[PDB]
Design an enzyme around this catalytic site. Sequence first.
Site, PDB file in Angstrom:
ATOM      1  N   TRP A 130       0.852  -1.214   0.000  1.00  0.00           N
ATOM      2  CA  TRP A 130       0.000   0.000   0.000  1.00  0.00           C
ATOM      3  C   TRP A 130       0.871   1.241   0.000  1.00  0.00           C
ATOM      4  O   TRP A 130       1.449   1.633   1.017  1.00  0.00           O
ATOM      5  CB  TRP A 130      -1.070   0.143   1.109  1.00  0.00           C
TER       6      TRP A 130
ATOM      7  N   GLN B  21       3.240   4.551   8.082  1.00  0.00           N
ATOM      8  CA  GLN B  21       2.572   4.038   9.261  1.00  0.00           C
ATOM      9  C   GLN B  21       3.468   3.617  10.407  1.00  0.00           C
ATOM     10  O   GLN B  21       3.059   3.655  11.558  1.00  0.00           O
ATOM     11  CB  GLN B  21       1.672   2.875   8.864  1.00  0.00           C
TER      12      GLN B  21
ATOM     13  N   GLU C  55       7.331  -1.568   2.856  1.00  0.00           N
ATOM     14  CA  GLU C  55       6.849  -1.115   4.157  1.00  0.00           C
ATOM     15  C   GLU C  55       7.499  -2.099   5.172  1.00  0.00           C
ATOM     16  O   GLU C  55       7.570  -3.307   4.900  1.00  0.00           O
ATOM     17  CB  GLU C  55       5.307  -1.264   4.298  1.00  0.00           C
TER      18      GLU C  55
ATOM     19  N   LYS D 168       1.881   9.885   7.215  1.00  0.00           N
ATOM     20  CA  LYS D 168       0.756   9.916   8.162  1.00  0.00           C
ATOM     21  C   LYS D 168       1.127  10.400   9.544  1.00  0.00           C
ATOM     22  O   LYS D 168       0.614  11.407  10.028  1.00  0.00           O
ATOM     23  CB  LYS D 168      -0.005   8.561   8.207  1.00  0.00           C
TER      24      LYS D 168
ATOM     25  N   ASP E 273       9.079   2.718   3.049  1.00  0.00           N
ATOM     26  CA  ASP E 273       7.920   3.574   3.288  1.00  0.00           C
ATOM     27  C   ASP E 273       7.502   3.417   4.738  1.00  0.00           C
ATOM     28  O   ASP E 273       6.933   2.383   5.121  1.00  0.00           O
ATOM     29  CB  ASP E 273       6.763   3.139   2.329  1.00  0.00           C
TER      30      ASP E 273
ATOM     31  N   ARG F 162      -7.071  -3.757  12.403  1.00  0.00           N
ATOM     32  CA  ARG F 162      -5.827  -3.002  12.500  1.00  0.00           C
ATOM     33  C   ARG F 162      -5.942  -2.143  13.740  1.00  0.00           C
ATOM     34  O   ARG F 162      -6.792  -1.246  13.795  1.00  0.00           O
ATOM     35  CB  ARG F 162      -5.572  -2.178  11.250  1.00  0.00           C
TER      36      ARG F 162
HETATM   37  C1  LIG Z   1      -1.369   5.851   3.566  1.00  0.00           C
HETATM   38  C2  LIG Z   1      -0.085   5.375   3.077  1.00  0.00           C
HETATM   39  C3  LIG Z   1       0.631   5.985   1.998  1.00  0.00           C
HETATM   40  C4  LIG Z   1       0.050   7.189   1.216  1.00  0.00           C
HETATM   41  O1  LIG Z   1      -0.519   8.238   2.005  1.00  0.00           O
HETATM   42  P1  LIG Z   1      -1.570   9.249   1.317  1.00  0.00           P
HETATM   43  O2  LIG Z   1      -1.550  10.534   2.032  1.00  0.00           O
HETATM   44  O3  LIG Z   1      -2.882   8.577   1.415  1.00  0.00           O
HETATM   45  O4  LIG Z   1      -1.232   9.570  -0.166  1.00  0.00           O
HETATM   46  C5  LIG Z   1       1.813   5.484   1.539  1.00  0.00           C
HETATM   47  N1  LIG Z   1       2.319   4.399   2.140  1.00  0.00           N
HETATM   48  C6  LIG Z   1       1.760   3.747   3.185  1.00  0.00           C
HETATM   49  C7  LIG Z   1       2.500   2.541   3.744  1.00  0.00           C
HETATM   50  C8  LIG Z   1       0.512   4.263   3.670  1.00  0.00           C
HETATM   51  O5  LIG Z   1      -0.040   3.606   4.711  1.00  0.00           O
END
Ligand SMILES: *Cc1c(COP(=O)(O)O)cnc(C)c1O
Lengths: 431, 431
Positions: free
Chosen positions: B136, B244, B208, B270, B241, B404
């Site tokens: 994601w 989260q 991630e 986030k 990434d 989650r």
């Molecule tokens: C939510 C998320 C994103 C992207 O964030 P947005 O602001 O929705 O564009 C990218 N990577 C991960 C792992 C996320 O959970």
Amino acid sequence: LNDDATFWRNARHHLVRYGGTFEPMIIERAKGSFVYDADGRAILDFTSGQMSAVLGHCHPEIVSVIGEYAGKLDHLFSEMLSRPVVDLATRLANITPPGLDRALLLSTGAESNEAAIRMAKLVTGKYEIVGFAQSWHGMTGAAASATYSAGRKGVGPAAVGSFAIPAPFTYRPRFERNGAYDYLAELDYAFDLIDRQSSGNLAAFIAEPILSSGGIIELPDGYMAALKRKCEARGMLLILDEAQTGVGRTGTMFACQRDGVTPDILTLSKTLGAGLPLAAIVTSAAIEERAHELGYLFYTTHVSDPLPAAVGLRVLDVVQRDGLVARANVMGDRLRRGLLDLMERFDCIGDVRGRGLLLGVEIVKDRRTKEPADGLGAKITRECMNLGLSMNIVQLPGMGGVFRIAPPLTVSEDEIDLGLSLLGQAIERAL
Amino acid sequence: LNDDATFWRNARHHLVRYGGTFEPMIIERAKGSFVYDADGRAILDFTSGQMSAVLGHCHPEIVSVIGEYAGKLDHLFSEMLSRPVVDLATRLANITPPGLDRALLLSTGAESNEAAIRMAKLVTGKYEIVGFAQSWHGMTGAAASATYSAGRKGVGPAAVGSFAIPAPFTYRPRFERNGAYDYLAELDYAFDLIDRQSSGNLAAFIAEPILSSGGIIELPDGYMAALKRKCEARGMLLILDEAQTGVGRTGTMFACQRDGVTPDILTLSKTLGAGLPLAAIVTSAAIEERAHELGYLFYTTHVSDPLPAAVGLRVLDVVQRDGLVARANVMGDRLRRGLLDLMERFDCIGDVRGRGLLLGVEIVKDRRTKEPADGLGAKITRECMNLGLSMNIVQLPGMGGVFRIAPPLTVSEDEIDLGLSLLGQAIERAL
Ligand SMILES: *Cc1c(COP(=O)(O)O)cnc(C)c1O
Ligand SMILES: *Cc1c(COP(=O)(O)O)cnc(C)c1O
Ligand code: NA
Ligand code: NA
Ligand code: NA
Ligand code: NA
């Protein structure tokens, strides 16, 4: 002083360079139409920051609203609705033309274009996207596949199925039909080529009413209508990106209002948030129902968040309440006439174009040859800054450099005059 | 009452549906670990909104900072620097591992991933991107081409050169080597396939540390190191990434710290903004110099804006100052043990996984068969809500539905207990 050792050290060592070159000042404060350096020097913000601060910097109403919300309702899980989201969506449906009924609230222009492109693909079941060869729709994915003004080189293949057509440019016409620049014939010619390359999966056309990044290029009269017809005949949706033109800048609430062509999907961004990250897509009920039946999904971290929505609403209230769209015509007229007077004075100003408070000044070697000025724009820019006028110039291949002028809708008569004054001086100093 | 006629009318008529289904309440206020409906009912926010409100809703410090800045320095032209941008960039370099020196400040996770993917392509001169089949990374373009958890169907071809490999999932192993789940052998096997399909243009791997959307899947021990080695041998960059996992959620400032593998590019989003749109990429000086020499460009409306940066800085200060990373271990331990006790009580809880305050609960038909529970998760979710506990469940093909769980880092002992209590009741009510 702006010449703070630590500041600069830290800047050279810790920032990623993303284009351009950092101005050598340290911005410490911003208010109305001006930004202030560390020496307290006032700099007239003739670009509304990055073409977004429609209400000028730190407008008390905005400040007020950011305040109420920051402490009351901030961010929520995507499935939870709140009043600012619903009120903003409702407001958007009400002020955009009929046929634009449902809204999606996001954070950036690129997201707004992506959301729209994705809905178009889903709804039509096709995937080819057509845009202008001079367009600017953002840096993220699809939006980027649809962007031809810059960033296509060195980063690999673009999205499968992207095509671009030339935008109508009255200043440097290139398509003649019986002695005159026939921009509609140009359109016909471009579409025929498209038709030949397509694999039969034309989904949508995405366009800006006034090409901002592309050099302040205004789609001429009857163009939009002709474009819309080209789309209808092919079963394609028309997406209008009003990131820069929306929210009164050109003298109408939305640029599409001037032409009278309502798009299938309208996207908004820079001006909607007035400086904060807020964006949106507006579409017809029919399109939305369909996408919904088809399983449309568009999730972002900040979709439907209350704080940003509360801000957007306040922005619309102010604009409506203060008659800011009208003001755009009046101040824009004052500015334009001033630019025309400069053009009387200096042979290097080749064209003054745009609408309302979205104006462009094309710099050239000489008025007849229309040869682009090599290095002068940069000088001019430099002197402006020195004189205290913040400007932005864009250079595109085959065009003279273009100053993009876009003061806040709240700009005063004096500020317009001050800017006109500093500009002339800058030019005089730069020859 | 939440049953406001006008509100709902407006909502059905003016909002684009973007997935899911709107909760039937009207959120009116938010504070700390709770959100409140129109009836003033307190709802425990067990997901920190959309997994972002690390400091809970409307934290006074944040409220305080949003306030100072909103009225002093808001948004600026991209070429103008200010102290919050420089201080935040400097801060990021200092708290991330050595080798992560230069930062780019943006607005969203998708933008952050795009910026990173683009730098990787430029710097290596190649264009193929590899990610996890359960990843994601956002909805915008490249980020979307790299996303395999959802949104691949019906919207046409993805980006040219995208490949995905299976993520290591210890709960439902599928790759055996001499009687045991050998996740490293799985990795070797996946890369060999990649190697065979590649056109010889492998640019980067994006991952991630804990797959959030994919069902709270933790990369097992030694995996990351093995991944990083796979990349090095192929001349690929490793992009991590941490949208989260970053900012203390898993018990370390950054998840990468646990493993000890430092990526080539780190993206944050986030949690950095704590509810507001702020995102960033952090890379080594060497990578940045190169991209710069190559002409790297990444322009957004809000890059380097002062307000959002001031907020991010405040977030880091609070986290550091209040020992929030540590707190994550302590509360996370309290929550985990509670979930394990639930698992003692109910046969439908098949697995409790995750780290720190990023936990997942997989719901199953029966503990041995590990058959996914059909419809139960939804019931459970429903009862939680009724009881006043806001939860989020995700369902992926071939897995049981997964809750989650991610409370604010500021969550109290009582809140953890209250949530554990409501959860048990919800489950008991749902059988
Ligand atoms: C939510 C998320 C994103 C992207 O964030 P947005 O602001 O929705 O564009 C990218 N990577 C991960 C792992 C996320 O959970
Ligand atoms: C700036 C801009 C966008 C994208 O906005 P971002 O927030 O930078 O993603 C899209 N379209 C137009 C016409 C723009 O000017
Ligand atoms: Na939200
Ligand atoms: Na409308
Ligand atoms: Na900026
Ligand atoms: Na570092």
